[PDB]
Design a protein around this ligand. Structure first.
Ligand SMILES: Nc1ncnc2c1ncn2[C@@H]1O[C@H](COP(=O)(O)OP(=O)(O)NP(=O)(O)O)[C@@H](O)[C@H]1O
Length: 424
């Protein structure tokens, strides 16, 4: 049929969905930015819903982003959160899908295995749900049916949610890979790809999964598909990712991009191995007892030992490791956001692809051997809006990383221990 004409409204539905500065651009032929949602005939379903959704003027991001996207041009955008980046890609993407129609491929087959027209990859359940909920707002009265899947939840209901129809898919990388291997999702006709919060997805170690999804499967190559990345920070691993996934794109930054962090306090202390346990105890005693704490250690043997130690000195802690049985799983995780056990001891490898959310204090009991992993770990601080904290224990075992750590601290505008320079 037709995908520009709105469907009959449902009043049951609207009450559900609808509860009441410099900018830099870098690249060829970047189409001029925009006044108001009115320039570019998005189409009725969009502004129909735009007025429903309280949006009055697009956001600074939404405004350099939405036209670039509508003009079939890849982009790499940097913006702090609360900047309205979600609607920035959802609005124009969905607008196109409404105008162009499902597409001859899908049509030619109109259950079970689904082929999404658009794939949005998100780091966490919380953000994935967020994107999903606004997708519903802007797909209301359309024949586009969005879905969301994520880890740390029953896959059975998700699978069945998929089989009801899925044109726009929001997903955490680990769960999407699970769906593909199960034959539930195919990317053969995916025409729009979005990596929201890319830097964080890399911090949690989703890169192998993301490269499985994009590069190693049936997903249309760049130039054919339209690809968009949104990232707070812009590390080198991220510009390499943009190099590999994007095609002659436009670069956007509203506030100027910090290389990393900006909402984490960073504190390095010299602590001999002999003293780490006592030092940790002091750190924890100063913790706002409700605040969640993540403790990284090097080996599993070390993770079980420390956690054992903490539990007997009477702390509510849990461990995630791999001498551990696989479904103690989220049980450890699930106790973490519960506040039942505000201290989680873990190895970096055992925390790969785990949505360890709302962590206020990250403690590197042991430091990794490269600065890139160090960036990954302190990346587990939670919210944007609220300053987070990263304390690292350092000694002679960590000599190799002084200069990298020193440069990072300087570029992050953090206090530099006066002995650290002397070590380099
Ligand atoms: N043009 C707009 N006018 C008013 N409010 C808006 C506009 N665009 C988005 N918002 C609201 O701003 C809030 C935060 O923006 P959102 O759509 O979540 O993107 P975002 O916050 O930049 N991405 P993230 O920070 O990771 O959550 C939401 O409640 C949106 O409904």
């Amino acid at each position: 049929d037709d995908w520009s004409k709105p469907l009959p409204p449902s009043e049951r539905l609207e009450q559900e969905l609808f509860s009441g500065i410099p900018v830099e651009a870098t690249g060829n032929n970047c189409p001029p930015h925009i006044e108001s949602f009115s320039d570019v005939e998005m189409g009725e379903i969009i502004m129909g819903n735009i007025e429903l959704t309280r949006y009055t003027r697009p956001t600074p991001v939404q405004k350099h982003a939405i036209p670039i996207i509508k003009e079939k041009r890849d982009l790499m955008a940097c913006a702090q959160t609360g900047s309205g980046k979600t609607a920035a890609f959802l609005l124009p993407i969905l607008s196109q899908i409404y105008s162009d129609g499902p597409g001859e491929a899908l049509r030619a087959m109109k259950r079970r295995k689904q082929y999404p027209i658009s794939l949005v990859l998100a780091p966490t359940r919380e953000l994935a749900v967020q994107i999903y909920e606004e997708a519903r707002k802007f797909s209301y009265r359309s024949r586009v049916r969005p879905c969301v899947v994520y880890g740390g939840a029953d896959i059975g209901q998700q699978i069945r949610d998929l089989e009801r129809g899925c044109h726009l898919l929001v997903a955490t990388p680990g769960r999407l890979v699970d769906m593909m291997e199960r034959g539930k999702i195919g990317l053969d006709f995916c025409k729009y790809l979005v990596l929201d919060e890319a830097d964080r997805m890399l911090d949690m170690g989703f890169e192998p999964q993301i490269r499985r999804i994009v590069e190693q499967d049936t997903m249309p190559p760049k130039g054919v598909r339209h690809t968009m990345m949104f990232s707070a920070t812009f590390p080198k691993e991220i510009q390499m990712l943009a190099r590999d996934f994007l095609d002659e794109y436009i670069f956007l930054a509203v506030g100027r991009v910090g290389s990393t962090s900006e909402n984490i306090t960073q504190k390095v202390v010299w602590v001999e191995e002999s003293d780490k346990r006592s030092f940790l105890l002091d750190l924890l005693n100063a913790t706002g007892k409700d605040s969640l704490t993540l403790v990284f250690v090097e080996t599993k043997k070390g993770a079980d030992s420390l956690e054992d130690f903490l539990y007997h000195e009477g702390y509510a802690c849990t461990s995630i490791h791999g001498d551990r049985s696989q479904r103690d799983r989220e049980e450890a995780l699930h106790q973490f956001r519960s506040g039942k056990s505000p201290i989680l001891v873990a190895t970096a490898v055992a925390a790969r692809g785990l949505d360890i959310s709302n962590v206020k204090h990250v403690i590197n009991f042991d430091l990794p051997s490269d600065i890139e992993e160090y960036v990954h770990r302190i990346g587990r601080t939670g919210r944007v809006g609220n300053l987070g904290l990263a304390t690292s224990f350092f000694n002679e075992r960590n000599i190799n990383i002084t200069k990298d750590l020193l440069d990072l601290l300087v570029e992050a505008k953090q206090e530099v221990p006066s002995w650290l320079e002397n070590m380099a």
